[PDB]
Amino acid sequence: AENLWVTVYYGVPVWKDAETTLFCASDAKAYETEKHNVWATHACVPTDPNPQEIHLENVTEEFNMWKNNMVEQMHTDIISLWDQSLKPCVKLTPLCVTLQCTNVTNNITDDMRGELKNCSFNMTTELRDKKQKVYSLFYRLDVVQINSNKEYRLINCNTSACTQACPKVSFEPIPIHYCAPAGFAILKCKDKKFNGTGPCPSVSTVQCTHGIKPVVSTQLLLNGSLAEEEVMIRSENITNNAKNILVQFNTPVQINCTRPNNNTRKSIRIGPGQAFYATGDIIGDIRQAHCNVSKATWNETLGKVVKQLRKHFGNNTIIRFANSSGGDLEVTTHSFNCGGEFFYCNTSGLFNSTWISNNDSITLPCRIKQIINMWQRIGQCMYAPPIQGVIRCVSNITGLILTRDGGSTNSTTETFRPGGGDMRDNWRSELYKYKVVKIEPLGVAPTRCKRRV
Amino acid sequence: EIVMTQSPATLSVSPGERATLSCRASQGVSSNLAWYQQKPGQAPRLLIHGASTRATGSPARFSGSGSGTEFTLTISSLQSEDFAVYSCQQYHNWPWTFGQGTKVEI
Amino acid sequence: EVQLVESGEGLVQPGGSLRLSCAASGFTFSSHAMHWVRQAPGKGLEYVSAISSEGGSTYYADSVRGRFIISRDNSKNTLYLQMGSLRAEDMAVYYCARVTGDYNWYFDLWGRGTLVTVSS
Amino acid sequence: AVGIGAVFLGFLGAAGSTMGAASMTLTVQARNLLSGLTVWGIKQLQARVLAVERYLRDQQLLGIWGCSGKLICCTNVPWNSSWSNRNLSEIWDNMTWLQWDKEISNYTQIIYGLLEESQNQQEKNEQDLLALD
Amino acid sequence: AVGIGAVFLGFLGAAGSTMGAASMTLTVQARNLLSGLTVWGIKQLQARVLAVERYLRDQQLLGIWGCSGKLICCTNVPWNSSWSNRNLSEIWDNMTWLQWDKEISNYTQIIYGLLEESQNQQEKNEQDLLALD
Amino acid sequence: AVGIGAVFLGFLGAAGSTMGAASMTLTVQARNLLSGLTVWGIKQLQARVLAVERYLRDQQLLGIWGCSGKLICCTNVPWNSSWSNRNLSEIWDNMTWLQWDKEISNYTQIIYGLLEESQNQQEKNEQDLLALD
Ligand SMILES: *[C@@H]1O[C@H](CO)[C@@H](O[C@@H]2O[C@H](CO)[C@@H](O[C@@H]3O[C@H](CO[C@H]4O[C@H](CO)[C@@H](O)[C@H](O)[C@@H]4O)[C@@H](O)[C@H](O[C@H]4O[C@H](CO)[C@@H](O)[C@H](O)[C@@H]4O[C@H]4O[C@H](CO)[C@@H](O)[C@H](O)[C@@H]4O)[C@@H]3O)[C@H](O)[C@H]2NC(C)=O)[C@H](O)[C@H]1NC(C)=O
Ligand SMILES: *[C@@H]1O[C@H](CO)[C@@H](O[C@@H]2O[C@H](CO)[C@@H](O[C@@H]3O[C@H](CO[C@H]4O[C@H](CO)[C@@H](O)[C@H](O)[C@@H]4O)[C@@H](O)[C@H](O[C@H]4O[C@H](CO)[C@@H](O)[C@H](O)[C@@H]4O)[C@@H]3O)[C@H](O)[C@H]2NC(C)=O)[C@H](O)[C@H]1NC(C)=O
Ligand SMILES: *[C@@H]1O[C@H](CO)[C@@H](O[C@@H]2O[C@H](CO)[C@@H](O[C@@H]3O[C@H](CO)[C@@H](O)[C@H](O)[C@@H]3O)[C@H](O)[C@H]2NC(C)=O)[C@H](O)[C@H]1NC(C)=O
Ligand SMILES: *[C@@H]1O[C@H](CO)[C@@H](O[C@@H]2O[C@H](CO)[C@@H](O)[C@H](O)[C@H]2NC(C)=O)[C@H](O)[C@H]1NC(C)=O
Ligand SMILES: *[C@@H]1O[C@H](CO)[C@@H](O[C@@H]2O[C@H](CO)[C@@H](O)[C@H](O)[C@H]2NC(C)=O)[C@H](O)[C@H]1NC(C)=O
Ligand SMILES: *[C@@H]1O[C@H](CO)[C@@H](O[C@@H]2O[C@H](CO)[C@@H](O)[C@H](O)[C@H]2NC(C)=O)[C@H](O)[C@H]1NC(C)=O
Ligand SMILES: *[C@@H]1O[C@H](CO)[C@@H](O[C@@H]2O[C@H](CO)[C@@H](O)[C@H](O)[C@H]2NC(C)=O)[C@H](O)[C@H]1NC(C)=O
Ligand SMILES: *[C@@H]1O[C@H](CO)[C@@H](O[C@@H]2O[C@H](CO)[C@@H](O)[C@H](O)[C@H]2NC(C)=O)[C@H](O)[C@H]1NC(C)=O
Ligand SMILES: *[C@@H]1O[C@H](CO)[C@@H](O[C@@H]2O[C@H](CO)[C@@H](O)[C@H](O)[C@H]2NC(C)=O)[C@H](O)[C@H]1NC(C)=O
Ligand SMILES: *[C@@H]1O[C@H](CO)[C@@H](O[C@@H]2O[C@H](CO)[C@@H](O)[C@H](O)[C@H]2NC(C)=O)[C@H](O)[C@H]1NC(C)=O
Ligand SMILES: *[C@@H]1O[C@H](CO)[C@@H](O[C@@H]2O[C@H](CO)[C@@H](O)[C@H](O)[C@H]2NC(C)=O)[C@H](O)[C@H]1NC(C)=O
Ligand SMILES: *[C@@H]1O[C@H](CO)[C@@H](O[C@@H]2O[C@H](CO)[C@@H](O)[C@H](O)[C@H]2NC(C)=O)[C@H](O)[C@H]1NC(C)=O
Ligand SMILES: *[C@@H]1O[C@H](CO)[C@@H](O[C@@H]2O[C@H](CO)[C@@H](O)[C@H](O)[C@H]2NC(C)=O)[C@H](O)[C@H]1NC(C)=O
Ligand SMILES: *[C@@H]1O[C@H](CO)[C@@H](O[C@@H]2O[C@H](CO)[C@@H](O)[C@H](O)[C@H]2NC(C)=O)[C@H](O)[C@H]1NC(C)=O
Ligand SMILES: *[C@@H]1O[C@H](CO)[C@@H](O[C@@H]2O[C@H](CO)[C@@H](O)[C@H](O)[C@H]2NC(C)=O)[C@H](O)[C@H]1NC(C)=O
Ligand SMILES: *[C@@H]1O[C@H](CO)[C@@H](O)[C@H](O)[C@H]1NC(C)=O
Ligand SMILES: *[C@@H]1O[C@H](CO)[C@@H](O)[C@H](O)[C@H]1NC(C)=O
Ligand SMILES: *[C@@H]1O[C@H](CO)[C@@H](O)[C@H](O)[C@H]1NC(C)=O
Ligand SMILES: *[C@@H]1O[C@H](CO)[C@@H](O)[C@H](O)[C@H]1NC(C)=O
Ligand SMILES: *[C@@H]1O[C@H](CO)[C@@H](O)[C@H](O)[C@H]1NC(C)=O
Ligand SMILES: *[C@@H]1O[C@H](CO)[C@@H](O)[C@H](O)[C@H]1NC(C)=O
Ligand SMILES: *[C@@H]1O[C@H](CO)[C@@H](O)[C@H](O)[C@H]1NC(C)=O
Ligand SMILES: *[C@@H]1O[C@H](CO)[C@@H](O)[C@H](O)[C@H]1NC(C)=O
Ligand SMILES: *[C@@H]1O[C@H](CO)[C@@H](O)[C@H](O)[C@H]1NC(C)=O
């Protein structure tokens, strides 16, 4: 067996890491009307009703959750869809005008004092010659005084012009599946104790990921996926305090949010075939918006998180939780979108505790806004039309985003505070078990066969 | 791991009339489904394979149908010898999985 | 008449070892793949391990990987299952099923079944 | 028939098996290498174009080595022990294609070059022989 | 020369003739299967990509059956009477390909599967034979 | 090895050499025929599509002549002196492919049809011969 020769094999199972462009695939049920959705699943290919998955025995692979190129592509696609859904909508250039505002003091509690303003202004009409005098209600977070009934202006007038969101389109998230082209593949890690980095001893290959809902929020991961066995803590470098920590819950925690104001909508014609939806009067009483969580359920979940955090810091260290340090409203509060409106809740009653080495509810006051700056961009804003009637939504808390404070030496105390901001960490919490590889179906090996002349 | 749910847990039907069993799949398994019968103390037997084809040698009264994630088994007539446990198995995604098993009582 | 019979039952202490055999007769044994399946008392059927026709590929379940070894002997038409480091949860009746065809993965012929018990 | 009597078959299903056992399922991976103005306007077109180009590039190489339309093709180039001195038993029964790829990744271009010239010589000699008649 | 002495030839010209007569003009249909940002921007590109993809998909099947680079290829798979029990004279002299396709449309996948495994076995045996020498 | 001992090799390197000498470097040109919304958006895509189409169109012709997967293929069509009466020595030792193309550019289409019909006849005869057995 010394007269060995080269033999060529086509179609061998080997692969290499690669970066390519994936394409979406939405469910067929999404085609039943409901074309009014920001996530334009109209152009998404229908999914396979029966997905196929192959188990890869004896195969060990290396994953790096913090250098995944799938995350970068998802961010760009989400931003592009957001921008594209706003092109055929009204542009509110003429709304940049001096306003004459006064406080709304009519059946209000002591906490809603100075939060609503009643402004009136001149507006253009469908005819280019004449103008109209109108009025509307604005939140105190969208108006800035310029120098009784002092005169204000919209906060964005000196940076850009807002685009009104088309009232028919809906913001409800819809599951999306990412699929790879021919000649590529996606590997999935089935280990239940995977910590995001290192070798995964249980692997399998698929052609499309499971349905991922693009939910936007900060400080709290909503309507996500749950761990199978235990609370999972993941970080790029646990010993470095400049890196965020991701937490995945073992069980869900319910949160109830509502806006207890019966709002009214008005239509104002500002041009030929163009309308601006203002806020009329409020029918009834005026009260603050809030969110509810169960005190008992939250306490249990925090206890499990502490137990899994001591493994990286020792059994004889004090663990304490504190609220955010500072920054803009979008970073120091738990932001989210609940059926059209945009909330900014004060999560300072959640992170208030200290843990030693050894029925009721929590109410979080929230505010509301109408001028939205998404994706941390500058120069592009959006205007959210008012919603008529009362609002109520329910969802599950699935994880967290935390941050550690640099302490001198080992003071036996560690303090963690919530922190969000970058929206890539939201996608990273769902695509942590996937990677893209490239197939190489050509191999050469020695054998005893020889070509016949 | 696709999870097979079989309901009702226990079914009591007198001889002669209809008898229906349900097997629900947590994920679309197409038509790759089979039904098995096991008497107490005997070697289990194959009745339905492919969710629509009758196993060779089985009585014709047995009949099942369904595709996707909903499947059903029906027997034209219940005989004295039909008392047994019935389970559904899917062979779409490895590893193969079985249902909890529905008990039929005369 | 095609049929399979299992043997080797007995009493085994926790952490012990036990070997099972499933003799076959009435068909070409070296042309079909085999499986091992167990049913715990009060639970459903769960897959344990599998082996290819020629015995060149073996598959294991996660709970048994590293403790069980499966082998076959085409000459004597026999199937073997070697158990090591037994535990309490390994309580069931073990059936040696058979696979039919190269694209019909469902079983077509089961076995009588044998009962294995662990106690101190 | 029962074919080879396998537990199951699928794309890349034999990645963890020995090179001897994985060589009986080449068609499984071979048949899935071709198909198996909005935002998604070009994300669907460029991918298809790239897949076609890669497939054709792979096919051309087999074409110029004389192995067109084949899955296992024997050649006329002797194996050089410098590339690997391992036995024929510890290669086809104790290694997987993923491992083997790493070992000989350095010498791939040398072999690719040798095969081309071997085929060229064969073609020229065949033409001469036919011309003689 | 006068070739086969036909009244005329053209694409799909022999669609209404018997399967025996239509088999002498395969090249006529074979050669016309490849080429024979405004509104009209992508309506010209997607069509071309689709045509190329379909052509390659058809070629690959012939490739894996061992019939690459051929118009009429003989195989090693016996015919099963269950598919069709008709004589050899009433098929090649009393039927057209359009009618034939309807009859055996149900069993196409079975035949496609058999043809692949036959070629796999042939290739394996061919490799084994050369090693003995 | 030293191969053919050439001063240098490259794409179109032997354009000004005799047809005899240029025939030993066919692989050099063969391997470089496949890869060797902004303004630059479609200027990259249409070019790639066109290249793929041209390559496939060229390959199909070899396919239907029976010369698939070959660089030098012998045929069964005798040469007609009307096309060119020059000797065999003043063609392969005193002319270049560029000059030769001009001389016989008129009769290229005539030669192509004969190559197709010869292959058709060969396939039919082979099928009959195999059927006899
Ligand atoms: C985490 O996940 C949870 C659950 O998936 C999610 O909560 C769900 O949010 C959606 C989106 O808001 C809710 O769907 C809305 O529900 C309201 C209330 O209707 C409920 O009750 C009726 C009667 O019992 C049921 O028939 C109905 O199915 C609901 O259960 C609806 O009013 C909403 O419809 C309006 O909005 C749609 C989208 O904008 C429009 O397409 C639709 O036409 C409706 O608008 C029209 O009517 C309005 C009222 O007349 C009018 O004002 C409009 O101008 C227009 O004419 C919508 O169906 C769903 O109920 C929530 N689920 C639960 C259990 O509460 C969380 O939001 C999610 N978390 C995050 C952060 O996203
Ligand atoms: C995933 O990976 C695992 C482990 O790497 C694979 O499982 C192994 O598979 C190999 C075969 O590929 C098994 O090795 C074979 O074992 C047979 C059984 O005999 C064993 O027991 C006797 C008695 O104790 C020992 O003497 C003997 O050495 C074995 O330990 C042997 O009979 C086999 O030898 C035969 O074949 C070889 C090769 O042709 C010949 O050289 C021999 O002379 C003889 O004819 C062989 O040694 C191994 O036991 C398996 N391990 C386990 C733990 O099960 C999986 O197959 C793999 N899965 C996939 C999908 O790739
Ligand atoms: C909307 O447009 C109307 C009309 O252009 C504006 O009303 C005008 O406001 C100016 C500003 O004060 C008035 O000028 C002042 O008038 C008083 C009373 O005559 C006079 O004493 C002052 O010396 C000064 O000239 C102007 O008269 C008034 N016009 C009318 C018809 O009332 C209005 O301010 C604009 N804005 C809003 C919010 O309505
Ligand atoms: C109307 O509301 C304003 C607040 O928007 C009151 O003005 C004060 O504004 C300062 C600056 O934010 C606050 O710190 C004070 O608390 C506000 N109240 C007072 C009494 O100073 C204003 O008083 C309200 N009433 C009227 C008639 O304008
Ligand atoms: C906001 O101010 C407007 C006036 O600019 C109020 O609307 C008027 O209220 C008076 C007082 O009842 C009525 O007589 C008028 O008919 C209303 N309309 C107009 C055009 O003047 C409005 O009520 C105020 N809203 C709040 C919440 O205070
Ligand atoms: C647009 O106007 C806003 C409001 O005046 C500016 O934001 C303010 O900037 C000053 C800087 O001297 C701060 O003291 C204020 O606190 C800011 N206001 C708020 C509400 O944060 C903003 O800088 C202006 N933009 C441009 C481009 O001039
Ligand atoms: C996640 O687990 C991996 C191991 O699977 C950890 O990576 C190892 O970390 C140790 C030190 O803790 C190093 O000595 C090893 O070299 C690392 N191995 C690899 C492959 O990187 C990783 O630190 C864990 N991360 C967290 C956040 O727990
Ligand atoms: C993870 O973070 C720790 C702490 O920041 C890194 O350890 C530091 O490494 C720098 C070298 O650049 C030293 O100067 C510091 O003294 C180290 N600090 C400690 C506490 O050891 C560590 O290198 C980081 N891990 C990786 C892989 O970069
Ligand atoms: C919010 O206010 C609207 C408008 O007042 C209420 O809608 C009306 O409710 C009454 C109930 O007595 C009906 O008779 C009317 O037909 C409704 N439509 C109108 C007046 O246009 C709505 O019920 C209120 N929602 C609350 C209080 O939750
Ligand atoms: C959230 O919790 C608050 C209390 O923490 C609930 O407020 C109560 O609401 C009922 C119904 O309107 C009132 O009778 C009580 O007086 C309220 N409690 C107070 C004022 O302390 C609220 O209903 C809960 N639900 C939501 C959606 O916020
Ligand atoms: C959040 O709202 C949900 C409503 O869906 C509450 O669930 C209900 O809770 C009451 C308790 O008073 C039960 O009687 C109902 O049966 C529950 N409904 C359902 C559908 O389960 C939930 O308790 C609220 N949670 C918080 C923290 O406010
Ligand atoms: C975080 O919690 C603290 C304590 O509950 C809040 O209290 C303020 O803390 C800042 C410094 O952290 C002080 O300057 C203020 O005087 C404190 N009181 C008030 C009324 O602000 C703090 O505001 C909370 N921070 C956030 C962003 O919610
Ligand atoms: C978030 O909520 C906390 C608690 O309600 C706020 O901190 C309190 O602020 C009030 C004044 O608004 C003070 O009287 C309390 O003493 C503060 N709490 C403590 C423990 O000192 C906090 O300011 C809120 N965040 C904001 C407003 O951004
Ligand atoms: C957050 O924690 C602080 C500190 O425990 C709470 O503030 C008060 O703290 C004093 C002693 O430091 C206690 O005697 C009081 O009972 C605490 N407040 C109350 C209402 O009991 C604060 O209540 C906690 N909750 C927040 C900040 O929302
Ligand atoms: C939030 O969590 C709840 C509780 O886990 C989820 O409700 C479950 O939904 C599944 C799928 O429909 C059902 O099979 C379970 O029976 C539900 N649980 C209960 C107790 O009924 C809910 O789907 C999660 N998502 C939300 C609320 O959006
Ligand atoms: C929370 O739970 C812990 C133990 O799980 C208990 O000691 C504590 O009193 C509870 N309440 C708070 C506010 O931490
Ligand atoms: C084998 O390769 C080595 C270096 O890789 C070289 O020195 C030797 O000459 C080669 N032998 C051959 C090709 O026979
Ligand atoms: C390779 O073959 C030699 C000679 O038979 C033997 O001594 C050696 O052990 C073998 N090595 C293997 C099989 O790894
Ligand atoms: C022919 O097909 C029938 C069913 O279509 C099948 O029962 C029979 O076994 C087949 N015979 C063969 C393949 O020889
Ligand atoms: C088929 O052949 C048989 C036997 O020669 C003959 O009896 C029958 O008529 C033929 N059927 C045709 C030609 O349709
Ligand atoms: C093909 O099968 C279908 C059922 O799937 C049947 O209706 C049809 O008649 C069959 N065609 C032929 C020619 O037998
Ligand atoms: C050669 O070509 C000439 C015209 O080009 C023609 O007259 C003659 O018949 C041909 N001879 C052949 C094809 O043998
Ligand atoms: C062609 O060959 C003939 C006969 O050998 C000779 O007379 C003539 O000179 C040759 N012409 C060339 C080589 O150009
Ligand atoms: C080819 O034919 C054209 C006329 O169609 C003629 O002008 C030219 O000279 C011919 N070329 C040769 C090389 O005979």
Side-chain angles (χ1 to χ4, degrees), chain A residues 49-311:
Chain A
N50 311 287
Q52 190 125 41
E53 154 165 27
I54 315 297
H55 173 62
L56 268 39
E57 184 104 344
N58 282 336
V59 168
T60 289
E61 251 288 316
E62 280 261 334
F63 293 82
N64 186 199
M65 150 182 207
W66 308 101
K67 261 138 80 154
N68 203 347
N69 192 245
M70 302 175 76
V71 179
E72 311 304 330
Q73 297 213 25
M74 179 146 147
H75 200 50
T76 301
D77 293 7
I78 295 283
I79 284 174
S80 298
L81 293 172
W82 179 268
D83 283 357
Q84 188 188 70
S85 92
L86 272 167
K87 258 203 175 211
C89 295
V90 177
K91 188 107 190 202
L92 291 181
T93 311
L95 257 292
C96 264
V97 154
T98 292
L99 318 152
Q100 302 248 321
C101 307
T102 179
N103 299 347
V104 171
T105 54
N106 213 11
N107 289 345
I108 70 176
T109 299
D110 302 1
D111 49 355
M112 292 286 293
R113 284 219 298 287
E115 300 277 295
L116 270 159
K117 318 221 86 91
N118 193 4
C119 310
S120 76
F121 48 99
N122 290 307
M123 196 84 259
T124 70
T125 322
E126 272 151 359
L127 296 178
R128 216 207 64 233
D129 324 297
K130 29 197 75 169
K131 280 148 53 148
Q132 52 180 330
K133 169 165 198 185
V134 284
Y135 87 91
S136 175
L137 261 63
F138 288 116
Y139 282 108
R140 201 214 55 185
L141 281 172
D142 306 337
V143 292
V144 200
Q145 201 180 68
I146 53 182
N147 241 4
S148 76
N149 78 320
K150 294 283 144 186
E151 31 204 41
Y152 297 76
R153 60 142 174 105
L154 292 181
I155 192 149
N156 74 279
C157 272
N158 67 337
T159 325
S160 60
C162 270
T163 306
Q164 164 162 285
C166 284
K168 287 280 157 264
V169 180
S170 193
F171 294 113
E172 251 296 89
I174 297 286
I176 289 140
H177 311 244
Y178 282 73
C179 309
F184 292 75
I186 288 162
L187 306 173
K188 163 156 85 143
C189 176
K190 290 153 43 162
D191 195 4
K192 303 183 155 181
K193 297 289 176 32
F194 190 56
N195 78 348
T197 302
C200 175
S202 212
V203 187
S204 89
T205 172
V206 300
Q207 201 69 12
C208 302
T209 77
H210 74 295
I212 293 156
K213 277 178 294 201
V215 185
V216 190
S217 49
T218 64
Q219 295 197 5
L220 256 78
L221 304 163
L222 299 173
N223 288 0
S225 273
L226 299 102
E228 299 89 332
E229 290 199 20
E230 290 179 335
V231 168
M232 288 298 310
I233 280 84
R234 316 193 159 93
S235 176
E236 198 169 356
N237 181 356
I238 200 77
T239 75
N240 179 6
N241 58 273
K243 298 285 167 184
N244 283 338
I245 301 160
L246 268 62
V247 186
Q248 196 178 42
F249 283 7
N250 195 357
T251 68
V253 192
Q254 216 174 32
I255 186 151
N256 288 339
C257 300
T258 196
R259 189 207 75 213
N261 280 350
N262 195 348
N263 261 13
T264 323
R265 205 157 81 159
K266 269 199 301 181
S267 201
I268 286 156
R269 284 139 158 261
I270 59 162
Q274 289 184 325
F276 160 72
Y277 303 99
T279 316
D281 262 31
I282 288 146
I283 318 183
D285 200 7
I286 282 161
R287 283 158 296 155
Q288 220 187 351
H290 51 232
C291 293
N292 284 353
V293 304
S294 176
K295 208 211 298 301
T297 304
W298 186 248
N299 187 356
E300 293 172 12
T301 293
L302 260 180
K304 304 200 280 230
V305 172
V306 167
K307 149 168 65 60
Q308 298 276 337
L309 260 171
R310 266 170 187 147
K311 289 178 193 195

Side-chain angles (χ1 to χ4, degrees), chain E residues 83-86 90-91 95 97-107:
Chain E
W83 304 334
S84 164
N85 66 281
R86 305 168 73 91
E90 90 174 20
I91 283 176
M95 271 192 43
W97 282 99
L98 273 165
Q99 307 183 8
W100 177 254
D101 166 65
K102 278 188 248 287
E103 284 206 347
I104 65 128
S105 44
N106 275 334
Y107 323 96

Side-chain angles (χ1 to χ4, degrees), chain A residues 34 36 167-173 213-217 222-223 265 334-340 386-389 391-396:
Chain A
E34 70 157 72
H36 316 147
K168 287 280 157 264
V169 180
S170 193
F171 294 113
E172 251 296 89
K213 277 178 294 201
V215 185
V216 190
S217 49
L222 299 173
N223 288 0
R265 205 157 81 159
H334 161 45
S335 324
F336 65 107
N337 160 234
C338 163
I387 299 280
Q388 207 155 9
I391 290 179
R392 186 140 186 288
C393 49
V394 184
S395 35
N396 297 319

Side-chain angles (χ1 to χ4, degrees), chain A residues 4-16 20-24 40 43-45 54-59 73 77 80-81 84 181-185 205 207 438-451 453, chain D residues 8 10-16 23 26 29 33-36 38-40 43-44 47 50-51 54-55 58-59 61-62 65-67 70-79 83 88 91-92 97-98 100-101 104 111-112 119 122:
Chain A
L4 305 183
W5 313 84
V6 172
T7 305
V8 185
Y9 292 81
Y10 183 61
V12 293
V14 329
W15 59 68
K16 292 200 197 127
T20 194
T21 65
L22 317 187
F23 59 91
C24 69
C44 277
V45 174
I54 315 297
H55 173 62
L56 268 39
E57 184 104 344
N58 282 336
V59 168
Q73 297 213 25
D77 293 7
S80 298
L81 293 172
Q84 188 188 70
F184 292 75
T205 172
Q207 201 69 12
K438 177 223 296 177
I439 314 301
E440 311 262 34
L442 219 62
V444 285
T447 299
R448 292 223 309 288
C449 168
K450 180 180 183 336
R451 193 179 268 173
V453 293
Chain D
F8 81 94
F11 191 57
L12 297 176
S23 281
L26 301 182
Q29 292 93 39
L33 284 159
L34 211 37
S35 189
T38 56
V39 160
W40 323 107
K43 309 236 290 176
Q44 192 108 33
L50 180 73
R54 296 227 310 147
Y55 172 86
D58 269 2
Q59 288 296 301
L61 252 54
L62 291 161
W65 297 342
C67 300
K70 267 147 154 295
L71 297 196
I72 305 165
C73 168
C74 290
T75 65
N76 244 329
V77 180
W79 189 263
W83 305 335
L88 203 90
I91 284 178
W92 292 101
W97 283 101
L98 273 166
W100 176 256
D101 185 44
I104 66 132
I111 305 157
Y112 285 16
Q119 169 66 350
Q122 281 186 230

Side-chain angles (χ1 to χ4, degrees), chain E residues 87-117:
Chain E
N87 298 28
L88 203 89
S89 82
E90 90 174 20
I91 283 176
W92 290 101
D93 299 330
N94 270 271
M95 271 192 43
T96 81
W97 282 99
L98 273 165
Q99 307 183 8
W100 177 254
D101 166 65
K102 278 188 248 287
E103 284 206 347
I104 65 128
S105 44
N106 275 334
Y107 323 96
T108 280
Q109 297 299 325
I110 287 86
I111 304 157
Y112 285 16
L114 291 162
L115 285 168
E116 164 158 11
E117 97 185 29

Side-chain angles (χ1 to χ4, degrees), chain F residues 10-130:
Chain F
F11 195 52
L12 302 179
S17 299
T18 46
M19 320 207 300
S23 278
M24 284 137 54
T25 84
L26 296 183
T27 52
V28 182
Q29 288 92 34
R31 64 166 100 116
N32 297 295
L33 286 161
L34 211 39
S35 190
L37 270 309
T38 57
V39 158
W40 318 110
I42 285 185
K43 308 237 289 176
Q44 265 265 59
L45 208 64
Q46 252 165 8
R48 291 152 84 196
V49 172
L50 179 72
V52 167
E53 304 194 293
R54 296 229 308 146
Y55 175 85
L56 287 180
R57 190 93 39 69
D58 269 2
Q59 289 294 312
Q60 166 158 51
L61 253 54
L62 293 162
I64 61 167
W65 296 343
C67 301
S68 37
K70 268 149 153 295
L71 295 194
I72 306 165
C73 170
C74 291
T75 64
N76 244 326
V77 180
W79 190 259
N80 185 16
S81 203
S82 179
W83 304 333
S84 164
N85 66 282
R86 304 168 73 91
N87 298 29
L88 201 91
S89 82
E90 87 174 19
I91 282 178
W92 292 100
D93 299 329
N94 267 269
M95 269 192 44
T96 85
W97 281 102
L98 271 164
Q99 306 182 10
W100 176 254
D101 185 46
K102 281 188 249 287
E103 284 208 349
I104 70 135
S105 43
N106 277 339
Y107 322 96
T108 282
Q109 294 298 326
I110 282 85
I111 300 160
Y112 280 15
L114 301 159
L115 290 166
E116 195 176 325
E117 91 185 50
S118 198
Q119 174 69 350
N120 241 328
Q121 292 197 11
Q122 282 185 229
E123 261 169 22
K124 135 172 73 64
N125 288 329
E126 183 179 350
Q127 192 225 338
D128 282 357
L129 179 88
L130 283 185

Side-chain angles (χ1 to χ4, degrees), chain A residues 366-432:
Chain A
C366 315
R367 301 156 92 78
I368 300 182
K369 262 210 220 138
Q370 307 230 68
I371 291 159
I372 315 301
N373 271 271
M374 299 276 258
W375 323 124
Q376 302 189 126
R377 282 187 307 192
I378 293 301
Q380 323 206 38
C381 63
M382 190 203 83
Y383 191 86
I387 299 280
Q388 207 155 9
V390 192
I391 290 179
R392 186 140 186 288
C393 49
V394 184
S395 35
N396 297 319
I397 304 168
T398 282
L400 291 173
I401 305 162
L402 301 173
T403 307
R404 211 181 77 229
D405 295 359
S408 155
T409 66
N410 303 346
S411 184
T412 77
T413 204
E414 289 284 0
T415 189
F416 303 90
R417 331 183 95 97
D422 194 1
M423 216 59 70
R424 279 189 214 77
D425 288 345
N426 277 60
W427 322 144
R428 214 184 299 280
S429 73
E430 292 285 271
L431 303 166
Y432 74 96

